[PDB]
From a paper:
Using a phenotypic assay monitoring the degradation of the immune adapter TASL, we identify feeblin, a chemical entity which inhibits the nucleic acid-sensing TLR7/8 pathway activating IRF5 by disrupting the SLC15A4-TASL adapter module. As our previous data had shown that interfering with SLC15A4-TASL complex formation abolished TLR-induced IRF5 activation, this suggested a strategy to target the pathway with high specificity.
C5 is an elongated molecule comprised of an aromatic 2-(4-ethoxyphenyl)-quinoline moiety followed by an amide bond and an aliphatic 2-methyl-1-propylpiperidine. We used cryo-electron microscopy (cryo-EM) to determine the structure of C5 in complex with the SLC15A4/ALFA_Nanobody. Finally, we resolved the structure of dimeric SLC15A4/C5 complex at an overall resolution of 2.50 Å. The cryo-EM map showed well-resolved densities and was sufficient to successfully build most of the protein region, the C5 molecule and two cholesterol molecules per protomer at the dimer interface. We found an extra density at the bottom of this cavity which was identified as a C5 molecule in each protomer of the SLC15A4/C5 complex. C5 binding occurs at the canonical substrate binding site within the large family of proton-coupled oligopeptide (POT) transporters, where dipeptides are seen interacting in the human SLC15A1 and SLC15A2 cryo-EM structures. Assisted by the high-resolution map, we finally determined that the bound C5 molecule within the cavity adopts an L-shaped binding pose, which was coordinated by several interactions at the interface of the N- and C-bundles, including electrostatic and hydrophobic interactions. Collectively, the structural data reveal that C5 stabilizes SLC15A4 in its lysosomal outward-open conformation.
Numbering used by the authors:
A (entry chain B), B (entry chain A): 18 to 135, 150 to 248, 313 to 356, 361 to 520, 525 to 558
The structure:
Amino acid sequence: RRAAAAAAAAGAFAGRRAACGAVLLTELLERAAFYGITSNLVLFLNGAPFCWEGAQASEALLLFMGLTYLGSPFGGWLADARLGRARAILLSLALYLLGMLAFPLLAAPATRAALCGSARCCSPATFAGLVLVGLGVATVKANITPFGADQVKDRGPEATRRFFNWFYWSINLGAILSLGGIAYIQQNVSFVTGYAIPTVCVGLAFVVFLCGQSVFIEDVKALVKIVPVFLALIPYWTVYFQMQTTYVLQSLHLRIPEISNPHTLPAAWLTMFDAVLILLLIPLKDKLVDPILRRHGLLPSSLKRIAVGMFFVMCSAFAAGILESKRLNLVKEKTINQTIGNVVYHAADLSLWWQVPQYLLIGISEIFASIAGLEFAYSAAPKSMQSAIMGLFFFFSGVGSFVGSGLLALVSIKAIGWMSSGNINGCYLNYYFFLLAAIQGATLLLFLIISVKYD
Amino acid sequence: RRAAAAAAAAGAFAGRRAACGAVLLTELLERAAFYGITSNLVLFLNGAPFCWEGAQASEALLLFMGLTYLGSPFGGWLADARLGRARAILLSLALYLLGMLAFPLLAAPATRAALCGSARCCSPATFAGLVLVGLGVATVKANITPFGADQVKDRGPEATRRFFNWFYWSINLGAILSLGGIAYIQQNVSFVTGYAIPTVCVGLAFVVFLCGQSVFIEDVKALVKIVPVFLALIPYWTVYFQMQTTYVLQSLHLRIPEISNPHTLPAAWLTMFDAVLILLLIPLKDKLVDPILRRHGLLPSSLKRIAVGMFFVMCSAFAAGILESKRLNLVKEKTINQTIGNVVYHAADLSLWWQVPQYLLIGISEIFASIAGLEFAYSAAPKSMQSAIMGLFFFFSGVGSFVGSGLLALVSIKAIGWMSSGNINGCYLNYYFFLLAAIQGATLLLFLIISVKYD
Ligand SMILES: CCOc1ccc(-c2cc(C(=O)NCCCN3CCCC[C@H]3C)c3ccccc3n2)cc1
Ligand SMILES: CCOc1ccc(-c2cc(C(=O)NCCCN3CCCC[C@H]3C)c3ccccc3n2)cc1
Ligand SMILES: CC(C)CCC[C@@H](C)[C@H]1CC[C@H]2[C@@H]3CC=C4C[C@@H](O)CC[C@]4(C)[C@H]3CC[C@]12C
Ligand SMILES: CC(C)CCC[C@@H](C)[C@H]1CC[C@H]2[C@@H]3CC=C4C[C@@H](O)CC[C@]4(C)[C@H]3CC[C@]12C
Ligand SMILES: CC(C)CCC[C@@H](C)[C@H]1CC[C@H]2[C@@H]3CC=C4C[C@@H](O)CC[C@]4(C)[C@H]3CC[C@]12C
Ligand SMILES: CC(C)CCC[C@@H](C)[C@H]1CC[C@H]2[C@@H]3CC=C4C[C@@H](O)CC[C@]4(C)[C@H]3CC[C@]12C
Ligand SMILES: *[C@@H]1O[C@H](CO)[C@@H](O)[C@H](O)[C@H]1NC(C)=O
Ligand SMILES: *[C@@H]1O[C@H](CO)[C@@H](O)[C@H](O)[C@H]1NC(C)=O
């Protein structure tokens, strides 16, 4: 029947292995270079060559992250009006290499005096490197997501679903290689070697495209029809980025095992726990949910898969507040010392691996909501305005990130006092996970109404 | 359009006010007589005239409740094969009056010696009264639910939806008048007056029918298509009846305010808290969800409204375990004494009205799942086999009640120890609400697959 014709299209890519594989390898090397900057930027700026304060190093990363979301609609509109796609990603990866090159030069003591030898020490050389990398990320993310799906666009809307499974797989594989390997080198071996590795990862990502150019391939009503879907995701992004911040804070105050008898393991390894599960669950989805949910006709659309992923975000926030209520009860009796990075944390005597049911549930959530979110921004976009809708899709991702940071500033005031105090043992973090479960539950009920009124 | 034609049918009952109103008043007086027996049966049998043990009084109520679920398919098949509907409810309410009459006779000291004057003291007079009342409830519930919807069956499947709103409203109104008024009289005034009131409520329910007779009005494939829906509700009934038991246990160990300066308020008032909210939320649904969800085309089917009600059961179980973790933390510091019934309870100094967010969520759940559950058992039944499907619908309601009681026996063993100990301050009741949230969440995901594969 029609289910057999869709399962026949599941045998996809069919000759376009080098066309799609050049896109997967480019984004694998671009995510490997993004977490080369983001993981140890504050440790680098608040260090021995640069004597910046802790607030000035954190506000430099906050303006860097916000520039990767603010520049996405402009980096995608420029790929529609003036340039193409492939000329816009080659232009951006050239600028993403130029700003990236300043970080091995500032790390080296020989080349540091050439840039800024004669409050902030080297602010013209540092902030100029953050602008070119930040505008490089925003233009790539807006443009590499439709362009990779344009190769398998010919084989229906089901082959593009299988592309975003392995596109989101190589994003997480590039994050494991950067947060695991490169972030270990930047803290314990050298910043000179540790920033030269992601700069080579940009240059290889530029070469894979020039080697890969040989194999590559009513609307006003369509704009106002999809803006209420993106506005309904702003409370979803709020819960999403505040789990990434606060599950790491729960991991720091929990008993982390030691690995050897270069010491003092990085704090970027605690952000890997989400992405390790995604490497295990995408081959599980691609081989047991592309078959199984298709020949039973179950859950075919992209907007209903976002609502499934919203269900496992809420179940993760409950499982986090249950563990945090147990941990705050257990930290009153005894408290052990552990050092993560270069600061000691007062951890309870409860194992780190009790945080695994939190990461299964946001793991399963990104299996559904994150891959189908890329499918909706691609399919529900006009042909002239693709990658400018991807630009707005990651702009409202950043709007939810800053209103989530303002939510943490709201529960930190003296009137509420949930986050009044690097120690959270006097904070009520479990009450904040229960608030995120209530915001996510109201977001789920709101999104189901928007999803039906969209169709 | 078609939404205006459905809103025109929302102006329903249209001349059949006395036909439906005789059915609403009969079930109001039948629920008032059911909780006249159930609320203080154990206190009556374990009392001054009858010297039964606490186990023998509880097993008499457990065989009584199980007989109201076991006899429902047989009391409804008898209303299809041999008798009609109205001749089956008049026959059952005659037997529901005959067994009910033994309870004022055993309560009175003059007429007690005539029945059983010369282990268990008066077991032939007591168990014979429980059989006729128990078979009377099972035959009425199987038959009064299709028969009331047969009056407004002519005006489409939307007028029957408005019947089960006010049919389920008068069930809860009959429960407030019995658990509030009659259960107060049975414990503090007299059992003679206190059981004579629900016996008059049966006799008035028999007279309203004889006064109301003047105004009243492929299938083998249809059986096996709806059995997997009833089997998928067995984990829903498991969580449903175990919340009714364990929210009362949480209310007993929580600070209940006093009302006067007849003392010692009944324990049946703590079961009223669910039904008081239902009296406030059914006029809210009938006047703001029959309009609003209809002209927006939102959530039209009965099986998707059961899945909405399954979502608020799970959110109630989380809100219950969060309050119970706070209460067990607070009971370690200080503990007050309060007497409910005739036994003292060691309550924490936390107010009873913090249990209100638990009862809003199961309140909203019965607004969706309980009314739409009656609609599915009526609409998805063959015309020859109606009220035998209602009989199976309340039989699987009872299967979930006894497998829920076996779940409490499973978490009470020494290997798990969540319910190893009338005191729950040494028990982990919060871990049992979190288990019920996990069973309900897996039931929701199971029911959505069954609901799609049904359609
Ligand atoms: C309902 C909305 O659905 C979503 C749709 C799209 C995306 C999404 C996300 C990213 C990303 O930035 N992924 C981060 C990696 C893993 N990451 C590593 C550190 C710790 C936390 C962990 C999540 C991303 C990147 C590059 C190009 C596209 C991208 N599209 C997410 C959700
Ligand atoms: C997804 C399944 O959906 C449901 C469908 C039907 C029913 C249901 C239920 C009853 C009942 O027995 N209601 C009890 C009253 C209130 N009750 C009073 C004490 C404390 C607890 C509180 C719930 C009932 C009675 C008489 C005729 C029909 C009836 N149909 C329930 C759920
Ligand atoms: C009782 C008070 C709180 C009103 C409750 C309204 C909430 C609880 C209910 C009522 C209307 C419901 C929505 C109506 C719209 C739809 C479309 C339906 O096809 C899928 C479910 C979905 C998304 C429902 C989600 C839950 C919902 C929002
Ligand atoms: C989708 C939403 C509605 C899910 C419900 C979660 C929220 C609203 C529920 C879950 C647990 C509930 C809490 C249960 C226990 C307590 C502790 C008590 O000291 C104050 C009330 C309070 C704080 C309740 C507030 C409301 C509450 C937090
Ligand atoms: C619908 C479902 C997902 C609701 C979630 C309930 C389950 C998955 C959550 C609720 C409470 C959570 C628990 C919170 C506390 C503990 C105690 C600790 O010693 C081991 C982890 C453990 C056991 C967590 C396991 C997962 C957990 C039981
Ligand atoms: C990743 C592992 C746990 C597999 C997860 C399967 C669960 C989480 C998902 C996968 C398939 C999904 C179901 C597929 C069938 C449907 C019909 C769809 O129209 C409504 C939702 C519903 C009812 C889905 C509920 C959630 C569901 C059961
Ligand atoms: C943990 O660190 C604190 C801070 O110096 C110290 O007072 C305490 O003795 C340490 N405890 C252990 C067990 O090392
Ligand atoms: C509560 O009851 C117990 C049981 O007799 C008793 O020991 C205790 O003193 C009582 N406390 C108060 C405050 O009455």
